[PDB]
Every structure is written in structure tokens, then in C-alpha cells.
Amino acid sequence: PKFLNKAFEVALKVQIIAGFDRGLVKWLRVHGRTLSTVQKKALYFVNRRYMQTHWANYMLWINKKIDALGRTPVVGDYTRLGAEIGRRIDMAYFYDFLKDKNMIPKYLPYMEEINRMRPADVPVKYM
Amino acid sequence: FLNKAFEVALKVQIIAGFDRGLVKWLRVHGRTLSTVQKKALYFVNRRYMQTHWANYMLWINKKIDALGRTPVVGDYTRLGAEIGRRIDMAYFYDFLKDKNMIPKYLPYMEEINRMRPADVPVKYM
Amino acid sequence: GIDWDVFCSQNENIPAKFISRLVAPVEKMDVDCSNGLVPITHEHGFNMMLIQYTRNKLLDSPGMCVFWGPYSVPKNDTVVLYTVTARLKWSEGPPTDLSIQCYMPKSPDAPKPEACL
Amino acid sequence: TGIDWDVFCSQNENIPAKFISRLVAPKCLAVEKMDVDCSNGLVPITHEHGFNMMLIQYTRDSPGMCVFWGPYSVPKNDTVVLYTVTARLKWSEGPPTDLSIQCYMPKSPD
């Protein structure tokens, strides 16, 4: 009763969040002086929540690539595709927008909860 | 794409129905209107038929096909009378009067108004 | 091109009025409505059309165009949006895509607790 | 109960619009499905409880890109055009919520 093997999901999520986070570190080296601690934590949450929100369309794209492989997939295929998602998305549209508009979300306990979990454990919905 | 007699039956009945609706409306709200404004509304009836001829033809073709037999002119008289009765032109009369938007009466409107309903040109899509 | 406007009503039972003038020396126009693709012929000069807010029903007027919608809109939770679009194909010219939009107020009903509670 | 959302339109085709939405609801109410009707296809979204965000592109590698429908002419105004998508939220109870997401783009040239 699984939509996707758990190992494939974990590979994807780890690589996606890692890529988003690398982008956020790069952005914070420039703009991080202006932000409070809780705002920075809120942007880390924004990375994980963005993966949550868009997981289903990510799965459309992933399923296309996997199908184009023409063979049974292995975990390495999902590691690679998750890294591709993590690199290609430019989260700075959101970081810049939220900073400039003073719209960084107020940091709440559910955000802290998501931030404390390992990326591998961030829950996602396939449908 | 329609025999001329059928087209004429349609146009005669549609314009006649629109005009009767306009008569009923004018008995109530017509006192305030100039003669040329009333003429502009008669034109509005004929032009409305022109603008909507193609979608009316979708509807008419649907009915005629539903007859399940070769149609005769009387079928088009009936269906055209139905269109002429059913369209609520009073929404337009009310709006145009209330908003002071009755179109200025122009020569092309007079030209169309002078035509026999049977001769009002229509475009088949 | 065409000089047009849509005149929206204050009541869903009163249709909107689309009024257009072609001032020029339009092959066809089609309006994408919730009850289908409605063809319109743009004669020279004045042209009119009604656009209905409420659902398609059997004894509506033949050829009626029913709005798509209602849609929720941002920054006002007390109003809804109704819309159709139209495409005009000109002689040898590029097509024109029109957005025909009307806002209607919601009924201001008091909220109620979510059933699952 | 519903979602509290807004769209933040850019005045420039090079900056995608920002869709930002928050769901404050009892945990027993969920958005079972959400779909955004874009000119390049129907893009599925999961509207989680709390904060959610999405980009909408004016023009068209990466998964999930949503491009506006349009541009559309608007009446009586020759200096702007309309870009739009719609979305449907299907809830765990009650009628669906249909959103109109609209942005006006200054017209080139006026």
C-alpha cells in the first residue's frame, strides 16, 4: 500500500531540502545580517514546506524521468533527480520577495517541529 | 446554407416577436423617450437578430433535426416565433434607458429599420 | 479595434450587458461560456449580448451565454467573480482575446462551526 | 472556514507572481486536493495546514512550473492586459473552493 518506495522518497527529500538549504545559506551570507534568528529559522521552514506543497507535481516530473530510464529504477536515480530539483529551483524569488515585503512568516511551533525533524522524516502527500 | 423561404420565416417571426416585446415595454416607459430613441430601439431589435443569428442557427438546427422528418416553412415560422417570444430584450431596453445609453440614431440604423424583415441580411457561420 | 465594455448587474438574476462598436472601414467572434462556445457576429456599428450569471437551464433563452464562476478573489472574501473570454479572428490580422469579467457580492451569511467538530 | 490567500503580481514579466496562502483550520478539516489550471497544464498542489507558497510565470527542465493564461485585453484600458489562472480546492467536507488568480501587466507599448 505504498505510492513510492520509502527509500526513494527519502533520497528525494534529503536531496531536495539539501539543495534548497544550500541556496538559502548563499542568500543569507548576503542578506542574513538584517534578519533575526527566528526569521532565518522561518526561511528554513519555508524550504521544507515548499517541498511539502509541491511534492505532487515534483512526482509528475520524477515519474516522467524515471519512466524515460527504460529500466527498474534504483535509489541512485532518485538521489540524482532530487538533487536536480534542489539545484534548478531558484528559491531566491521567495527569499527576496518575503524579505522586501516584510512578509517572512511569524515563527510558530509547527514550523519549529518541521525544522527539528530530519529531512528524511518530513511528511509528504503524494496526491 | 438555409433555403430562403425558411430564412425569411425565421426573420419575420423573430423581429415581430422582438417588436411586440418592445411595444409592451414602450407602453410603460416610452413616454419619456424621443421618437428617434424609439427608432434606435427598433434598430436594436433587428441588429440583435443579426448579431445572434449564428447561435440561433445552432438552436434551430437542433430543433429541426429533432423533428425527425423533412421540415417545412411552418416549422421555421413556429421556431422563429419561439425565439421572438423568449429573448428578454427588456433587459436591454431597461439598461439603455436607465444609463442614458440608447445609441444615437445614425443613417445605417435607419437603413436597417426601413428594410422589410424578410430582407434584413444575416451571416451564416 | 472594437470599442467594447461590459456592464455588470447588482443582482445575479439580472444578466450582464456586453456592448461593442465596430468603427472601421471581424471574421468571427466566439465566447467561451460555461454552457458552451457561443458564436457572435460583429456587424459594423452597434452590437449587444447578454451574459447570464445563474446556471444553464432548459428554458433559458436560445443562444444564451452563461458566465463561468463564481470564483473567490483575494483581498475581498465578500465578493465573487464571474468571467467569460472571447476570441476575435480578424481578416489577415492577429486574433484578439478579450476578458469579460463581473463582480457580484456574496450573501453575507454568518459562518458556522466546521462539521468535523 | 477557508484559506486566507493573496497573489502578489509583479509589474514585470521577468518576475513570476507570488501566491501565498495560509490554512488555519481544525485538524479534522483538510484540503484533499488542490489543482491550479495553468496554460501549460493542471498543476497539483498540496495545501498543508499553515503556510504555503507558489510561483506563477508570465511566460515559459524544472518540475511544476505554472504559466498564466493570457494576455487578455480588458475593456476601455489600452495600457494593461490580463493574465489569469484558476484553482480548485476540494475539501474533506463541503463544496469545493474555486479561486481566480489574476494579474494585470502594463501593456507594451501603450
Ligand SMILES: *[C@@H]1O[C@H](CO)[C@@H](O)[C@H](O)[C@H]1NC(C)=O
Ligand atoms: C470588495 O472589496 C473592495 C475593496 O476592498 C470593495 O471596493 C468592494 O465593494 C468589495 N465588494 C463587495 C461585494 O463588498
Ligand SMILES: *[C@@H]1O[C@H](CO)[C@@H](O)[C@H](O)[C@H]1NC(C)=O
Ligand atoms: C488601466 O488600468 C490601470 C491599472 O491596471 C490604471 O492605473 C489605469 O488608470 C487604467 N486606465 C484607464 C484608462 O482606466
Ligand SMILES: [Cl-]
Ligand atoms: Cl467555473
